[PDB]
Ligand binder design. Sequence first.
Ligand SMILES: *[C@@H]1O[C@H](CO)[C@@H](O[C@@H]2O[C@H](CO)[C@@H](O[C@@H]3O[C@H](CO)[C@@H](O)[C@H](O)[C@@H]3O)[C@H](O)[C@H]2NC(C)=O)[C@H](O)[C@H]1NC(C)=O
Ligand SMILES: *[C@@H]1O[C@H](CO)[C@@H](O)[C@H](O)[C@H]1NC(C)=O
Ligand SMILES: *[C@@H]1O[C@H](CO)[C@@H](O)[C@H](O)[C@H]1NC(C)=O
Ligand SMILES: [K+]
Length: 361
Amino acid sequence: DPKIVNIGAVLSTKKHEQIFREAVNQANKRHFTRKIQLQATSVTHRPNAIQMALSVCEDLISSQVYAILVSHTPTPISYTAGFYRIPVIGLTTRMSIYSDKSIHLSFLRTVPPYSHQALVWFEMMRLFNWNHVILIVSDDHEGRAAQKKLETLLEDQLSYDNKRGPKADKVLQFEPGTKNLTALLLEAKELEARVIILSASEDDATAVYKSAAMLDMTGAGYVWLVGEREISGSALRYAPDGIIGLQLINGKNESAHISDAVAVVAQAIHELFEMENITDPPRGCVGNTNIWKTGPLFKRVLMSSKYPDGVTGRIEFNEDGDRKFAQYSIMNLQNRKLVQVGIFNGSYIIQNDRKIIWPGG
Ligand SMILES: *[C@@H]1O[C@H](CO)[C@@H](O[C@@H]2O[C@H](CO)[C@@H](O[C@@H]3O[C@H](CO)[C@@H](O)[C@H](O)[C@@H]3O)[C@H](O)[C@H]2NC(C)=O)[C@H](O)[C@H]1NC(C)=O
Ligand SMILES: *[C@@H]1O[C@H](CO)[C@@H](O)[C@H](O)[C@H]1NC(C)=O
Ligand SMILES: *[C@@H]1O[C@H](CO)[C@@H](O)[C@H](O)[C@H]1NC(C)=O
Ligand SMILES: [K+]
């Protein structure tokens, strides 16, 4: 007699589906009830967008899932499920587009968008009194989201220094995929400030680094401050010694995010079922143009939910459905090896015992 409540997932490997089932099992044990029983339904990723979308319909929506967890585009899944207002919960995708206020309105996620790295840059600027910076961003959605985020952060018996706040003397943008960025770097060289912040893809970061090298701008006096993509994979080849980048703590731990996302979903499902006039999700896509009437409400329940005991830390989502209070390892390139010199713990920079080597040091 328990009502079966299916949770869906699209995960990377069979082993992660096992982690998913175990999480759903844990959730049933956590919440005693005879009115509903949580069930796990999952698939792994298909090789292309078309097959992925079809599988979402054939394998997941056909089982009447209430939500779909998705590891790392999640684009076909977000769109296919969003059509019906079934919440899609991204476990590892960091691209800022999913945070946009106009599209992907059924999506939320347990990791922050790359644009949120700007919070950490801000604290770094405060800690080391970098009051003048140059921001170089790719002229695409991701580059501009980083810019927008950083700018937002920038914009009687007790004495105050009242020092003018940190400031971006200039924002320079480049066309993604451009192989020769000499003109841009020279434009930056003409400027006073020697603190350079970069938002760029792995591929574009290399272009920036090579141009900075050619112009002798990676040596003493300069500071390079970047995010995670700009010190990942191929971007590390020409990354200047002394550069500072970031790694999202637990950011690639799919297993941990599956556990936390299931916990959040189960909690929200129990709250949902205390409400009157709840409706069942769609059973299948074929000739079905109806939305899940309760879909939008369930997403609101999910996004306003709080799960303090996550394995990835406290879980809360902001108004765009992005994870709040993310923690980041602060990485410093030393002898061509990334060295962790501290943590941004959600609000403050906590330095450790290792010392930072600055560019040319
Ligand atoms: C990130 O680092 C910051 C700074 O160390 C941490 O904030 C600090 O947290 C402690 C413990 O919660 C706070 O102490 C407590 O403050 C309250 C009142 O505000 C009081 O009732 C407690 O008994 C105790 O004194 C401390 O004030 C706070 N400091 C700052 C600067 O806010 C924070 O906990 C770290 N975050 C994580 C997730 O680790
Ligand atoms: C990922 O997180 C899980 C917690 O479920 C932990 O058991 C595992 O050690 C983590 N893996 C890595 C490489 O951090
Ligand atoms: C749900 O719908 C019923 C039937 O119209 C209505 O009487 C009731 O007030 C509604 N319950 C809530 C809490 O909205
Ligand atoms: K969105």
